[PDB]
DNA sequence: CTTAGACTTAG
DNA sequence: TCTAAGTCTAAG
């Protein structure tokens, strides 16, 4: 199983097998919430349409794809013991927030993801990244994962946009996999959760299969009632809209 | 998760 | 615009 190079909230690593078991065959895989890209990195579609509302994430992905060798060499320099301290971290954070250069920002973004607290990505209303120092003994430099990503990215387009716009990119040859922000246990509003479900319904009647994962709650069962539900116990829910 | 600082609003 | 409750927000 190919691991992602970012430490990202909600890694689909433990559930890959269950996702891949219910993911229909197609020419193209569309992911409105690509995040770290676990499913992308562990499937074999001829092409991918990958999207996310986080512009730093999408920008990072475009650069890793287009300037791999240059990026890896520059990012590797930041993963030395000399950078594993608060003062250095907070300066790199300030450099990130003040940089107007996508490359340098992409470089620093990997550093902050790995050295900051628990791989969080938080912004203030001014758009400034304000995650505190993570206090790790030895952050890991995901070189092997970076190279694998760029290689696999040659068949992927990246778009910064909301789920409604990326799902509209789907066609008869497409399969849609949705990994929305988690529903509440018994940000991403309840309206948007429900709205996502009705878009899936719209796609399944245009003969476009859609797979959605989320927590297994009373709310998710209601939003996804038009779909064939599958429960994964450890509890996760897979909602399959198949023509 | 937690605390601090600040702004908005009812009374 | 008093005063304090109410709400929002930033960041370790
Ligand atoms: C990582 S997936 C969900 C993983 C897991 N379910 C969790 O919440 O921990 C969430 C991703 O969707 C993206 N996202 C949030 N809102 C979005 C929206 N309205 N449209 C498209 N992408 C969005 C975020 O950037 C985030 O990276």
Describe this structure in words.
It is a single chain. With 243 residues, this protein is an alpha/beta fold. The chain has helices at 16-22, 55-66, 68-76, 86-98, 102-115, 143-153, 163-167, 190-204, 218-223, and strands at 28-31, 47-52, 156-160, 174-178, 210-215, 228-232, 236-241. It is 38% helix and 15% strand. It has a 7-stranded mixed β-sheet, sandwiched between helices. The chain is globular, with a radius of gyration of 18 Å. The two termini are 30 Å apart. S-adenosylmethionine is lined by residues 8-10, 32-33, 35, 52-54, 162-163, 179, 181-182, 188. It is classed as transferase/dna. The entry lists the keywords DAM methylation, gatc recognition, base flipping, bacterial virulence, methylation-independent transcriptional repressor, Transferase-DNA complex. The assembly is trimeric. Complex of Escherichia coli DNA Adenine Methyltransferase (DAM) with AdoMet and a 5-bp non-canonical site (GTCTA).
Structural class of the secondary structure composition? alpha/beta
Number of domains: 2
In CATH's first tier, which class of the largest domain applies? Answer: Alpha Beta
Largest sheet: 7 strands, mixed
Q: What proportion of the residues form beta strands (DSSP E)?
A: 15-25%
Oligomer: monomer
**Cα separation of the termini:** 30 Å
Basic shape: globular
Q: Helical region count?
A: 9
Which ligands accompany this protein? S-adenosylmethionine
The gyration radius over C-alpha positions equals: 18 Å
Task: Please outline what is shown here.
The protein has helices at 16-22, 55-66, 68-76, 86-98, 102-115, 143-153, 163-167, 190-204, 218-223; strands at 28-31, 47-52, 156-160, 174-178, 210-215, 228-232, 236-241.
């Amino acid at each position: 199983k190919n691991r992602a190079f970012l430490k990202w909230a909600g890694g689909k690593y433990p559930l890959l097998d269950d996702i891949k078991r219910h993911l229909p065959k197609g020419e193209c895989l569309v992911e409105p919430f690509v995040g770290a890209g676990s499913v992308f990195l562990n499937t074999d579609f001829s092409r991918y349409i990958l999207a996310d509302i986080n512009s730093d994430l999408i920008s990072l992905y475009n650069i890793v794809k287009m300037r791999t060798d240059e990026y890896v060499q520059a990012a590797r320099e930041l993963f030395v013991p000399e950078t594993n301290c608060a003062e250095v971290y907070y300066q790199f954070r300030e450099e990130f927030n003040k940089s107007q250069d996508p490359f340098r920002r992409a470089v620093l973004f990997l550093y902050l993801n790995r050295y900051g607290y628990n791989g969080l990505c938080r912004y203030n209303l001014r758009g400034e990244f304000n995650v505190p120092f993570g206090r790790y003994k030895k952050p890991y430099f995901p070189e092997a994962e970076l190279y694998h990503f760029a290689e696999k990215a040659q068949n992927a387009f990246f778009y910064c946009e909301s789920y409604a716009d990326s799902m509209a990119r789907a066609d008869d040859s497409s399969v849609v996999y949705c990994d929305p922000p988690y529903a509440p246990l018994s940000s991403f509003t309840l309206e948007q959760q429900a709205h996502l479900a009705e878009i899936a319904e719209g796609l399944v009647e245009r003969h476009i299969p859609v797979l959605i994962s989320n927590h297994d709650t009373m709310l998710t069962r209601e939003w996804y009632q038009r779909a064939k539900l599958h429960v994964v116990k450890v509890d996760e829910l897979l909602a399959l809209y198949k023509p």
